[PDB]
């Protein structure tokens, strides 16, 4: 009559290895959810670093378009 061989390898591993102190944690994170990567251009304007230095220098800046939009109290 017909017959077939029988095997089924399925081990699991519990032997620990690779130990080191590994003691670290971090106090703060940002995790923005507004961040996404749809752009293909991936370009960015130098204005982003420029605005930082102009405002701390106290350099005079003026804008009009920032008025129209969502309001503030």
């Amino acid at each position: 009559g017909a017959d077939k061989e029988d095997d089924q390898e399925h081990p699991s591993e519990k032997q620990p290895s690779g130990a080191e102190s590994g003691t670290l944690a971090r106090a703060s994170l940002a995790l923005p959810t507004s961040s996404l990567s749809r752009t293909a251009s991936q370009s960015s304007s130098h204005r982003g670093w420029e605005i930082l230095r102009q405002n701390t220098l106290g350099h005079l800046n003026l804008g009009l378009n920032l008025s129209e939009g969502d309001g503030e109290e």
Binding site: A25, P32, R38, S44, I51, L52, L57, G63
Partner: protein, 150 residues
């Protein structure tokens, strides 16, 4: 010596002495431990000198020293430049934790105060655009370069 350059080999040289007592290596020691670290830094200076070091770092009065405050003291001894201040303060406004690098969140704080909204895609790409060595983070000399050169 190359201590003045604060190369990675040298930052490790004193970090080792700091971590000798900080077993977790978190980067935090108390001023009680700093006096012991001072023995590892040199040939047992007089108590006034030892005290002078713990006094300046413990300006806060909390008895505990965070690692970038330890670096602030050393960096000042090595740099010795008074005119650099036009640029240094600009970096410190957003670098509140003092880790010496710029993250996207740090730029978000500044641009929001203008009442303008940079896109998150622009802020994230600004870091790679500024960085010239592929590490994904920007340090002070890279920040100076942004305004002093194209």
């Amino acid at each position: 010596s190359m201590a003045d350059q604060l190369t990675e080999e040298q930052i490790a040289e004193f970090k080792e002495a700091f971590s000798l007592f900080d077993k977790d290596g978190d980067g935090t020691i108390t001023t009680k431990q700093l006096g012991t670290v001072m023995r590892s830094l040199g040939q047992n200076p007089t108590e006034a000198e030892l005290q002078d070091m713990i006094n300046e770092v413990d300006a806060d009065g909390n008895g505990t020293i965070d690692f970038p405050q330890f670096l602030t003291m050393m960096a000042r001894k090595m740099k010795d430049t008074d005119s650099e201040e036009e640029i240094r303060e600009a970096f410190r406004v957003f670098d509140k934790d003092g880790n010496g690098y710029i993250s996207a969140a740090e730029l978000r704080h500044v641009m929001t105060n203008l009442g303008e909204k940079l896109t998150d895609e622009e802020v994230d790409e600004m870091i790679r655009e500024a960085d010239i060595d592929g590490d994904g983070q920007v340090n002070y000399e890279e920040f100076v370069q942004m305004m002093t050169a194209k």
